[PDB]
């Protein structure tokens, strides 16, 4: 089979710059015939179906925006685009054509930096008819900060550690290309009652000093 | 008014066997042969094959040679894929494309997710979250709600039916324990919350839930 | 994808700055990374690098124009 290799395996570029992606056949996919690559780029978004951008290798389908580009022929090709905006988060594919079975690359996810920002947390005690039902959900939201690393600890303070601490993750923003996730804090009832302060504890490249957040076990 | 149709999510037990369909709609079915391609959780895209739609030929991808087959059904313009006695490994999201002569797919269906799984179908609960008045107060404010130990995927959420839309953080679930968790997460200007209402809509196809959720304040 | 994964830090001139991740064996992986760098270097020309970390992080520096 036509063995598909792409380049990066992902990539992280800020706004206005060039972003070039790379894909080398183990043949040539250039059809005697034809004059033409059997050369294909796709897009695909988080969650949705792929659509293409680029056939032939370098034809550009109608309605994509003239900022990508694509090149090469026989075995080396590129997709490269003039100015990555944050619409442009996602994770690109080439297929060929010239010979199946069908293959794509393994694919190159692009991603963007911006400027550096700190979370935007916020905590949430359980609630009634959760309480009501026996178990005890509590909440956190780091919302809108940059770097996507980040951890998180649950203390009803002298008490730091977890079990069912679950915590979740999004794909990059595409509006503002951040990052965020959620964390919740999974105990019994009973128990948060029995217990102290409830706190939240948020490590970002942005801080030194941990931002905390913690709640009313007094309107609560 | 030009597009592949696919059917909705399934849940399998191993074992058993699935039949997704996708239905043309706004073009000649019989001009253009059918692909299919799919796609693991978190993984790239792999060619599953075709089939002719004008003498119901289907080449198959060594890789689904075997349990997969392709028919047809050109008078209501539809293609099939069956996969023979599931597994956990064919938890998937399954494509059908178009394919043009120029060599690319143009149109392609939004997929049917295949999930292979053996844990029982349950429905959400759903908890409201809301900012306590114990310790601040910012300009902005942070509604939540929570969508708790259910099986299989999907739920969908909404705020404000639609709405709100323009600062929400909704979260991939999270498998345990046989059961998953979400949530959601949305800042509204506090010149609009006490004041506008903010609800959040919950949807569980599988289990048959509709539920709103307004959130009231403390 | 991911076998080992080289991190490379691309320089080029006017110190804007990408980052890649590199897909697969330490070796098939390291060399998509110079091939990368050279794809690049076709425009942004010639450069050096220092690797960091047992070879498993990478940082190309280009020369401009």
């Known amino acids: 089979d036509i063995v598909m290799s792409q380049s990066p395996s992902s990539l992280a570029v800020s706004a206005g710059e060039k972003v070039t992606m790379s894909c080398k056949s183990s043949?040539?996919?250039?059809?005697?015939?034809?004059?033409?690559?059997?050369l294909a780029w796709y897009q695909q978004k988080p969650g949705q179906s792929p659509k293409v951008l680029i056939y032939?290798?370098?034809t550009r389908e109608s309605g994509v925006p003239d900022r990508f580009t694509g090149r090469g022929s026989g075995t080396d090709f590129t997709l490269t685009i003039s100015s990555v905006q944050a619409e442009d988060q996602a994770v690109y594919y080439c297929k060929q054509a010239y010979i199946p079975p069908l293959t794509f690359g393994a694919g190159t996810k692009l991603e963007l930096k911006r400027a550096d920002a700190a979370p935007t947390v916020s905590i949430f005690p359980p609630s009634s008819e959760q309480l009501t039902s026996g178990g005890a959900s509590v909440v956190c939201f780091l919302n809108n900060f940059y770097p996507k690393d980040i951890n998180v600890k649950w203390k009803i303070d002298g008490s730091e550690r977890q079990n069912g601490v679950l915590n979740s993750w999004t794909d990059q923003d595409s509006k503002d290309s951040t990052y965020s996730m959620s964390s919740t804090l999974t105990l019994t009832k009973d128990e948060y009652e029995r217990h102290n302060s409830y706190t939240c504890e948020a490590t970002h490249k942005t801080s030194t000093s941990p931002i905390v957040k913690s709640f009313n076990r007094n309107e609560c | 008014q030009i597009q592949l149709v696919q059917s909705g999510p399934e849940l399998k037990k191993p074992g058993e066997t699935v039949k997704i369909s996708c239905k043309a709609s706004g073009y000649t079915f019989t001009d253009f042969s059918m692909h299919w391609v799919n796609q693991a959780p978190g993984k790239g895209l792999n060619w599953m094959g075709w089939?002719?739609?004008?003498?119901?030929?289907?080449t198959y991808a060594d890789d689904f040679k075997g349990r997969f087959a392709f028919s047809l059904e050109t008078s209501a313009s539809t293609a099939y894929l069956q996969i023979n006695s599931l597994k956990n490994e064919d938890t998937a999201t399954y494509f059908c494309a178009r394919f043009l002569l120029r060599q690319y797919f143009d149109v392609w269906g939004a997929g049917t997710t295949v999930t292979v799984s053996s844990a029982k179908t349950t429905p959400p609960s759903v908890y409201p979250l809301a900012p306590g008045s114990a310790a601040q107060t910012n300009s902005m404010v942070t509604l939540g709600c929570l969508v708790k130990g259910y099986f299989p995927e999907p739920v969908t959420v909404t705020w404000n039916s639609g709405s709100l839309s323009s600062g929400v953080h909704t979260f991939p679930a999270v498998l345990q324990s046989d059961l998953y968790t979400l949530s959601s997460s949305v800042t509204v200007p506090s010149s609009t919350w006490p004041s506008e209402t903010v609800t959040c809509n919950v949807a569980h196809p599988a289990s048959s839930t509709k539920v709103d959720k307004k959130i009231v304040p403390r | 994808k991911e076998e080992v994964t080289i991190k490379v830090n691309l320089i080029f001139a006017d110190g804007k700055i990408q980052t890649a991740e590199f897909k697969g064996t330490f070796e098939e992986a390291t060399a998509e990374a110079y091939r990368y760098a050279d794809l690049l270097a076709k425009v942004n020309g010639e450069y050096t690098w220092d690797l960091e970390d047992g070879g498993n992080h990478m940082n190309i520096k280009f020369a401009g124009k």
């Open positions: 089939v002719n739609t004008e003498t119901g030929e289907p």
């Open positions: 032939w290798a370098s």
């Open positions: 043949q040539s996919l250039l059809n005697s015939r034809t004059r033409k690559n059997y």
